């Protein structure tokens, strides 16, 4: 926690989502690598302990 306070580095998951820039219309887009990797990486979670 002390390192988290002092360091100027900050983590923004959105950098990933903008680099990919893919959206699924529905479940009918069955298989896709970009959506698969985004789904596994889960940018929506912000716990970096």
């Amino acid at each position: 926690v002390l390192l988290q306070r002092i360091s100027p580095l900050q983590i923004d998951p959105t950098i990933i989502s903008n680099t990919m820039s893919t959206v699924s219309e529905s479940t009918t887009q069955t298989l896709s690598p970009a959506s698969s990797i985004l789904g596994k990486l889960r940018p929506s979670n912000s716990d970096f302990s």
Partner: protein, 49 residues
């Protein structure tokens, strides 16, 4: 069933050239922060090589 080489290559290239500062931070500023904090700790470090 259908070719996916272009999509995998595109995703891998996007992940390859990403603009993250974390490797720079770990190379330069994190050691400095660790060295600054280290003398003040209540439990001094214990390292094997």
């Amino acid at each position: 069933t259908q070719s996916l080489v272009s999509s995998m290559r595109g995703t891998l290239d996007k992940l390859k050239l990403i603009k993250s500062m974390t490797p720079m931070y770990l190379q330069q500023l994190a050691p400095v922060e660790l060295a600054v904090i280290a003398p003040m700790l209540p439990f001094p470090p214990f390292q094997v090589p």
